[PDB]
Amino acid sequence: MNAKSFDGMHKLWMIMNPVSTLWAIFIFQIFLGLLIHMVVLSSDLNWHDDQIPVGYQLQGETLPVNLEMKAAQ
Amino acid sequence: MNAKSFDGMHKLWMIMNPVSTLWAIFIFQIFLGLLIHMVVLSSDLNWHDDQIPVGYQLQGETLPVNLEMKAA
Amino acid sequence: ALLNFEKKYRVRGGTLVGGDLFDFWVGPFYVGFFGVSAVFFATLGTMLILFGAAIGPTLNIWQISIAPPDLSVGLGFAPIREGGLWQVITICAVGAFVSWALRQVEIARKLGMGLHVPFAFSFAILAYLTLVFFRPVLLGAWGHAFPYGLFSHLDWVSNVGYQTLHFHYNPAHMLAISFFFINTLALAMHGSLILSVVNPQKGEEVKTAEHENTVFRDIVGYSIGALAIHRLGLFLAINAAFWSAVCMILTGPFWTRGWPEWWMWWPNLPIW
Amino acid sequence: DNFTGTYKMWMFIDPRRALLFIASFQILLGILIHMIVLGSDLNWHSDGIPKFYFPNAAEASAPIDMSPIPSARNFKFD
Amino acid sequence: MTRDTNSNWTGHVADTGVTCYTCHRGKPVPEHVWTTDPGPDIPSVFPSNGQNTIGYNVAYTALPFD
Amino acid sequence: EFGYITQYFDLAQVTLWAFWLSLLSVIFFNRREDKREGYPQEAVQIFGKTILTEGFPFMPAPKTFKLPHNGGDVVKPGPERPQYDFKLEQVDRFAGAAYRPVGNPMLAGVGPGAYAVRANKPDLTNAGDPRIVPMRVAKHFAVVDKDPDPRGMTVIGADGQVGGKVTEIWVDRAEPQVRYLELEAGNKKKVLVPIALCVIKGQKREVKVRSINGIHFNDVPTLSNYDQITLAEEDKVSAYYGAGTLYATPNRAESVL
Amino acid sequence: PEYQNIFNKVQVREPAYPGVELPKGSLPRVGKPIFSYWLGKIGDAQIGPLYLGGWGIASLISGFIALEVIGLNMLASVGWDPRLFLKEFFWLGLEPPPPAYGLSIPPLAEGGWWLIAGLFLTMSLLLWWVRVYKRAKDLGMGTHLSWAFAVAILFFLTLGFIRPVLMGSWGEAPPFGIFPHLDWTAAISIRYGNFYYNPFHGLSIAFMYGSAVLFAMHGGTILAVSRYGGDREIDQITDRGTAAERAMLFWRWCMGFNASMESIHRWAWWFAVFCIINSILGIILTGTVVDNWYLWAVKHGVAPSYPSELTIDNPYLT
Amino acid sequence: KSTTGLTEAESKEFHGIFMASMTLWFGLVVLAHILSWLYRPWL
Amino acid sequence: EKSTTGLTEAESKEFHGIFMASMTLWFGLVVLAHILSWLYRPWL
Amino acid sequence: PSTGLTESEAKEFHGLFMASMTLWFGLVVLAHILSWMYRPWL
Amino acid sequence: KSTTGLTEAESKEFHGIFMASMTLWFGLVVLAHILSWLYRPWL
Amino acid sequence: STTGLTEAESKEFHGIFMASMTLWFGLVVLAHILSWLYRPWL
Ligand code: BCL
Ligand code: BCL
Ligand code: BCL
Ligand code: BCL
Ligand code: BCL
Ligand code: BCL
Ligand SMILES: CC(C)=CCC/C(C)=C\CC/C(C)=C/CC/C(C)=C\CC/C(C)=C/CC/C(C)=C/CC/C(C)=C/CC/C(C)=C/CC1=C(C)C(=O)c2ccccc2C1=O
Ligand SMILES: COC(C)(C)CCC/C(C)=C/C=C/C(C)=C/C=C/C(C)=C/C=C/C=C(C)/C=C/C=C(C)/C=C/C=C(\C)CCCC(C)(C)OC
Ligand SMILES: COC(C)(C)CCC/C(C)=C/C=C/C(C)=C/C=C/C(C)=C/C=C\C=C(C)\C=C\C=C(C)\C=C\C=C(/C)CCCC(C)(C)OC
Ligand SMILES: [Ca+2]
């Protein structure tokens, strides 16, 4: 025991269906991937809206062409 | 009696189903565990937000890096 | 046109009024005395709605409106341009709806079947009569009924609702909404189940009644049965209509406060 | 001992059902404890350690219920 | 306060005005007044959201009670 | 400014159009599925000629049901079995006139007494056994006490006369419930009556059948074998009881008011 | 009169039916079936057995965790008193986070429990979806009940997760109460200018009324020909008898067109699903695209215009 | 008569192990409470 | 009569062996995770 | 054999299952090392 | 007639153990209440 | 044989499946390189 305690383990697939288990694992992994990405996006670690390395909407509002057109009105 | 009063007690499992009893006990214990933990967390004995042994949000707000960034 | 199997069922008899004079078909429709009545009243009502739109400000379909009299007319007779047209149209409407139900009874008698459908239609008719006749009579004026117009009867519904500050807390309103929601759920499940049993997985035989029972006992633990789901259906729809009629006869005639204050009878029971 | 014959448990309790219960329960309990600890002072995603990474609001009050919808994202309320 | 309301707020009390009797009605403490509502008793670590009770001043609804 | 407008075209508008087009298109498909039974229809022409027409929209292409236990294939829309031999006389000389039965109305198979021409096989259970059977063939059923056992009662027939006596109950094995009552009639034949046309009074120990008269129970159609019933026979029996709703008394088809 | 077929007059018992055989490799069914006399007066009397496999246990663990959370917060809101719980039960609720917190995870007594209960209820419904699909597919049937269930789940997720995320606040979602969720309904109509001028709301109301109409009509028609064996719809579909013929002649003569015994079930399916499709479409556009439904209806020529006679002075303009 | 199909020997066996397990569980509970009282006394 | 799972006594012994080994390994990993968390952010 | 797999088939499946799971966990570790280098969270 | 299948001997046996168990339970209840009165008297 | 494919058919399918997946991932990488050149997000 404690060195050879896990030798029968391969018999697991004689009571659990392999294809069902594969599908269950894949679906659970996709769901968990979406969930953790959404949980990290809703924290201080968010990487889409942090304006690093630059803010692009603000960059578009201050282009010289846009500024010169907004002056003419 | 008072000493021989509980003699035939082992016969209990001839009228009570062992499998149903086992499942009922396990499920009830899990439900009760969740309930008592939630009831104690909602009182003065709360141990996650009591700021002991130290407050961690407060610790993060007063790091020198955060202070120097907030100064501007 | 006749269906493949239709000719042997088109026999005479089964009528209520009239007799052999109106017992014929026009195309697929069956006419009868009440068929003539229904088409007469529908045509007249429609034409009067159109004229009431012509004397108004617009012929836009969404903005036509014919309104009932003022509350000062009471239960009397209003001028044609200020309410009487609404009264004539609301007479035509009753005539047409009752004619429809009796024509149904004639048809069912001819085909040899039970009178369940006209009986269930009667409860829609009853809700309409509650809104135009019973509630106005108990409150003392025809001008408590709704105007005829898309978008314009919705303004009526809104303001009547807010005359009680919060109409969601009306008890019979809660009960009726419960029945409406459960009815849509039941209809979805029934449709799905029959389709699923006669359209099985590709390359399989049509399933049986045992499959229908098994599927719902597996998912939920209880199956009501193929004849009782039809009953449950008639029941939920009729009850929805009934409690709507009750909720409107309560509002105004028997309760004039806000609707949240009714519920106050419960936390004031002397038992907690 | 007193626990000599415990292995006979699986002769009247189905081991397949037991496994299916335990896996589900453990995964759900994992998710639960993580969300509970994140909703407290022990939170480790937005605690500002070792640094605040977002452009947070300079003066964020203590939020009350009678509030409008915020204009920009913010994660530093304390 | 009564002089201020009677002279400067006629957009609301137009030429009918108020006296003491409009609120005291012959008693030193008026009958219908209010104070800042604390809410029901809840656990000490729970802040008040200010709703979901009976709500006697907002017509017995579950709306915000103060 | 309270009602200022910036732009007339928005997304709600387009989405509403898309919905108008997504409805208007399930109507099309459902109306096409509606015409797998009873079509093509028969349009009668100016001077009596009959043609087959099909309507709007047109009929769909045939689909196949594969019935269980080698019960054959059913194609729909497909062929039809031939009608039997009803006789009818028109009442007024135009295509939309009504018809009168020619002989004895009870034994004619027209009007509410018409029936369909189904298979001559019984309906089956999931195991292959006949579904509707008498309670002596299904040896595991029992009537729940608390309920009046109809076996023994009499069958009063809508004019007060006696029709016969109940001798058997016919059950449904797929969904356990009563479907027919078997009774011995006045001329000692065994006839069935559907349970949905019977009012059972436990204390009077009567069964009232409002459809037909007492003497009419002698001419109810009979079965081949009394250990099962086929689809055709079900139709014949039920239709005979349904003809009486209009033909039992000469005053039943005659305008209430 | 004649028997109306609303209650069962005579009942019969045989031994319980265990169910159609499942594919090999399946778990047994749990429970010993019991019989109800009162349920048998109106329908089938057997209760159980039940099938509990992998997906329907994970569901039922999620759902009960959610229920425990919701119940305990409602109970903490009255100070743990069960007497007050029963007294004021329709006014209690679990409330969403304050809108100023945005989409972050708030502390536990200021909206975090709402967030937990929402997550666990979501997972419960998706696991139940998989159960419903597999149960129908293992018996060899079409999976039509999973499509409608998917539509309903989508409506639950729209109001609640998708719209609050597109708006930027969890505080835009309903709470868990009875009177509290009714208050939410009224307030969201008041804030976005009158849902009666939302066109998707009008269309879904059209289809809810239609569901009630259609199911009264169908339930009536099949009870009215059950004397000719009409309640057995599978046989009337695969071998048309006189019950189906009479059922279709009735509607043809009455209103000029008809369906068949199989097609009416497709009409039912669609009338129940368009209601919820329009529900999703109407909620998803409110706030994110349209800010006042009445002003929208005025811009597109829909609202009536009552005569005025007066002039009211806006005091913010004075 | 309501019965579980266990004989008297099987019942004796089950009872032995059931009582042992319950005693061990209660022992662990007592230990948890002693630790909690040492850390944060509540009465 | 009595509720059974069809496992003999040998099969039950086998299952029990592997079940106990797996549970012990899982609890070992849990203890390790908590020691790391205590070193990083002590909560009591 | 409640799944119909013999013992040889189970051994085969187990071999490939364990290999695949190990590779997947390797990729996860790599993703986390990159994330720690970019934006350390503890 | 409603019957449980137990003879009179079986009923006597069941009754003996039932009464013993109920008495022990009530004893424990009394002890809990004495402790509670000593700690926090309520009347 | 649960899917009716023999071992040769499975080998064939696997060959083409792996080739297709590799090509798809190649195209994904190319799209991301272009996006990084145009609008870097980290
Ligand atoms: C601010 C307004 C209030 C409100 C104020 C009111 C008022 C006021 C009323 C309701 C009524 C109803 N409300 Mg409400 N209601 C509110 C919110 C809700 C909400 C929700 C989700 O919030 C729901 C689900 C409901 C649901 C309901 C139903 C219970 C009921 C409507 C069904 C009905 O009357 O059938 C009854 C059916 C009829 C009246 C139909 C008549 C049918 C006739 C006989 C046939 C006509 C045929 C036609 C002319 C032929 C055309 C032929 C062509 C050829 C096709 N209300 C808000 C809070 N509500 C109504 C009610 O209960 O009335 C009885 C009612 O008056
Ligand atoms: C201020 C309050 C204290 C606190 C005071 C207590 C007290 C007092 C008790 C617990 C108990 C428990 N606490 Mg605590 N607890 C605190 C904070 C926590 C936190 C946390 C995130 O903050 C967690 C996750 C836990 C979790 C737990 C569980 C281990 C345990 C409930 C077991 C159960 O329900 O069995 C239900 C399941 C069954 C009966 C089935 C059989 C059991 C299975 C096989 C094994 C389960 C775990 C086992 C007991 C431990 C592993 C085995 C041993 C190492 C040999 N506590 C704080 C710090 N907690 C109880 C306990 O440990 O009793 C033993 C208990 O009495
Ligand atoms: C401040 C708090 C700490 C923290 C404190 C803890 C503590 C304390 C623990 C965890 C544990 C876990 N943490 Mg952590 N954790 C933190 C932040 C995270 C973040 C993140 C986005 O920030 C993630 C995604 C995780 C995720 C995880 C999981 C790997 C693990 C939960 C296993 C489980 O759910 O049971 C799934 C169980 C089953 C399905 C049944 C048994 C498993 C069997 C053998 C089969 C499953 C396959 C495999 C073994 C699954 C686990 C992979 C690893 C090899 C363990 N933590 C922060 C920094 N975390 C738990 C753990 O380590 O378990 C060992 C744990 O005790
Ligand atoms: C600040 C946080 C980091 C970040 C930190 C992490 C960390 C840490 C992890 C990820 C992981 C993932 N991230 Mg990331 N991630 C970020 C931003 C993104 C963005 C984006 C729009 O911003 C996207 C689309 C992704 C997308 C992804 C996926 C590629 C991956 C989760 C896969 C999965 O769920 O498998 C679930 C599906 C299965 C298990 C199915 C079974 C296997 C199938 C058949 C094969 C699928 C192949 C797989 C997608 C990998 C293919 C790559 C090839 C080997 C070349 N990340 C930001 C920048 N991300 C995880 C990962 O990469 O896993 C290795 C991971 O550990
Ligand atoms: C101010 C109030 C006091 C208090 C005053 C009392 C009083 C007075 C009593 C209790 C009793 C109980 N208290 Mg106390 N109790 C307090 C705080 C707590 C707290 C807590 C989280 O704060 C908990 C978890 C408990 C829990 C308990 C249970 C042990 C017991 C309820 C048993 C029961 O319901 O069985 C009912 C279920 C069954 C009978 C099912 C049958 C199962 C069989 C018989 C085995 C069950 C084991 C049983 C639970 C306990 C026996 C203990 C062993 C000898 C170790 N109390 C506070 C400090 N408590 C009761 C008690 O002691 O009973 C003797 C009781 O009379
Ligand atoms: C700043 C962000 C960038 C941007 C960054 C990215 C990145 C990064 C990626 C994309 C990808 C895609 N982008 Mg882009 N994209 C932007 C703006 C656009 C706009 C637009 C209107 O503005 C459109 C219409 C698109 C559309 C597309 C699709 C062609 C492609 C998604 C494929 C897919 O969904 O597989 C779904 C369907 C399948 C997998 C089916 C399998 C294949 C089948 C057999 C046929 C598919 C043919 C395939 C669509 C076209 C490639 C063919 C070549 C001509 C050889 N992008 C902006 C400018 N985009 C992805 C891509 O290019 O994939 C390689 C991708 O990784
Ligand atoms: C008006 C005018 C200008 C008249 C001139 C014409 C003249 C001169 C005379 C014609 C003669 C007469 C008397 C005509 C009267 C008819 C007229 C004119 C109008 C009525 C038309 C009318 C009211 C139609 C409304 C139709 C609508 C909107 C129905 C709503 C419900 C709906 C959408 C149902 C679709 C699903 C269907 C078809 C359900 C029916 C149906 C159900 C419910 C089953 O249960 C069932 C069970 C088994 C087999 C079949 C069926 C079945 O077909
Ligand atoms: C053919 O096959 C045969 C049978 C012949 C041979 C087969 C052999 C094989 C293949 C055997 C396989 C065996 C396996 C893989 C066994 C796996 C065993 C495992 C991993 C067991 C793990 C068990 C874990 C348990 C029992 C943990 C329980 C934890 C509990 C109940 C915790 C409760 C915590 C609570 C209530 C705390 C709540 C705290 C808070 C704050 C969340 O509450 C609100
Ligand atoms: C005392 O009681 C006990 C404890 C004993 C148990 C008894 C339980 C009882 C009595 C419960 C009573 C319950 C009642 C009355 C409930 C009323 C419920 C109603 C009417 C609810 C109505 C609407 C709620 C809705 C639509 C909620 C929708 C929420 C959603 C979709 C949540 C989405 C959240 C998600 C997916 C999580 C995201 C979180 C994350 C981590 C990703 O954020 C970043
Ligand atoms: Ca602490």
- The yes/no answer on whether domain F101-248 falls in CATH 3.90.50.10 is yes
At residue G42, φ and ψ (nearest 5 deg) are -115, -20
- The answer to whether the CB of G276 falls within 8 A of the CB of G151 is yes
At residue G93, φ and ψ (nearest 5 deg) are -170, 165
Distance of alpha carbon G52 from alpha carbon E17, whole angstroms: 75
Question: Rounded to whole angstroms, what are the CA distances from C232 to C115, C117, F70, G12, G220?
Answer: 17, 14, 35, 21, 11
Q: How many CA atoms lie within 13 A of I22 on its CB side?
A: 14
Q: Which residues contact E25 (CB under 8 A, 6 or more apart)?
A: E31
In DSSP terms, which residues pair with F42 in a beta bridge? Answer: C2, F52
Q: Which residues contact G221 (CB under 8 A, 6 or more apart)?
A: C116, C117, G247, G250, G251
Q: Do E46 and B42 touch (CB under 8 A)?
A: yes
Mark which residues 78-97 of F lie under 8 Å from C by CB: 80, 83, 86, 88, 91-92, 94, 96-97
Q: How far is the CA of C19 from the centre of ligand 1 (A)?
A: 38
Question: Rounded to whole angstroms, what are the CA distances from C267 to C102, C166, C256, C271, G84?
Answer: 48, 19, 20, 9, 9
Q: How far is the CA of F20 from the centre of ligand 7 (A)?
A: 22
Angle CA(F133)–CA(F135)–CA(F139) in degrees, nearest 5? 105
Q: Do A45 and D53 touch (CB under 8 A)?
A: yes
Within an 8 Å CB–CB cutoff, is residue D77 touching chain A?
A: no
Within an 8 Å CB–CB cutoff, is residue G25 touching chain J?
A: yes
Distance of alpha carbon C217 from alpha carbon G49, whole angstroms: 7
SS (H, E, C) G88-126: CHHHCEECCCCHHHCCCCCCHHHCHHHHHHHHHHHHHHH
In DSSP terms, which residues pair with G13 in a beta bridge? Answer: F142
F50-52 and F42-44 strand pairing? antiparallel
In this structure, what DSSP letter does residue A7 have? S
Q: Which ligand is nearest to the CA of K42?
A: 5
- The answer to whether the CB of F153 falls within 8 A of the CB of F165 is yes
Distance of alpha carbon E23 from alpha carbon G194, whole angstroms: 38
Mark which residues 7-36 of H lie under 8 Å from D by CB: 13, 16-17, 20-21
Single-letter amino acid code for the residue at J32: H
Contact residues, chain B, for E47 at CB < 8 Å: none
Mutation test of ligand 6: which of L16, L25, L28, L41 has the most ligand atoms closer than 8 Å to its C-beta? L28
Distance of alpha carbon G93 from alpha carbon G174, whole angstroms: 10
The full set of domain ranges for chain C reads 1-163, 164-263
In DSSP terms, which residues pair with E25 in a beta bridge? Answer: none
Distance of alpha carbon G139 from alpha carbon G21, whole angstroms: 8
Within an 8 Å CB–CB cutoff, is residue G26 touching chain C?
A: no
In this structure, what DSSP letter does residue F59 have? P
Distance of alpha carbon C28 from alpha carbon G104, whole angstroms: 64
SS (H, E, C) chain C: CECCCCHHHCECCCCCCCCCCCCCEECCEECHHHHHHHHHHHHHHHHHHHHHHHCCCCCCCCCCCECCCCHHHCCCCCCHHHHHHHHHHHHHHHHHHHHHHHHHHHHHHHHCCCCHHHHHHHHHHHHHHHHHHHHHHHHCCHHHCCCECCCCHHHHHHHHHHCCCCHHHCHHHHHHHHHHHHHHHHHHHHHHHHHHHHCCCCCCCCCCHHHHHHHHHHHCCCCCCCCHHHHHHHHHHHHHHHHHHHHHHHCCCCCCCCCCCHHHHCCCCCCC
Tokens of F170: 């016919």
Residue E58, classified by CB atoms within 10 Å of its CB into exposed (0-12), middle (13-18) or buried (19+), is middle
Please state the separation of Cα F91 from the chain's center in Å.
27
Q: How far is the CA of F41 from the centre of ligand 5 (A)?
A: 79
Q: Which residues contact K5 (CB under 8 A, 6 or more apart)?
A: H1, H2
C25-26 and F73-76 strand pairing? unpaired
Q: How far is the CA of H40 from the centre of ligand 10 (A)?
A: 11
Within an 8 Å CB–CB cutoff, is residue D12 touching chain I?
A: yes
Tokens of G67: 């229920």
Return the closest-CA partner of residue G180 out of G256, G89, G106, G250: G89
Residue H30, classified by CB atoms within 10 Å of its CB into exposed (0-12), middle (13-18) or buried (19+), is exposed
Is B in contact with H (3 or more beta carbon pairs below 8 Å)?
Answer: yes
Return the closest-CA partner of residue G153 out of G116, G111, G124, G115: G124
C192 — alpha (psi -120 to 50), left (phi > 0) or beta?
A: alpha
Chains with ≥3 CB–CB distances under 8 Å to I:
A, B, D, H
Return the closest-CA partner of residue F110 out of F218, F220, F219, F246: F246
- For chain E, how far is it from start to end, CA to CA, in angstroms? 25
Distance of alpha carbon G223 from alpha carbon C135, whole angstroms: 33
In DSSP terms, which residues pair with F143 in a beta bridge? Answer: G12
G155 Cβ below 6 A of ligand 9: no
Distance of alpha carbon G269 from alpha carbon C185, whole angstroms: 10
SS (H, E, C) I1-44: CCCCCCCCHHHHHHHHHHHHHHHHHHHHHHHHHHHHHHHHCCCC
Mutation test of ligand 8: which of I5, I9, I19 has the most ligand atoms closer than 8 Å to its C-beta? I19
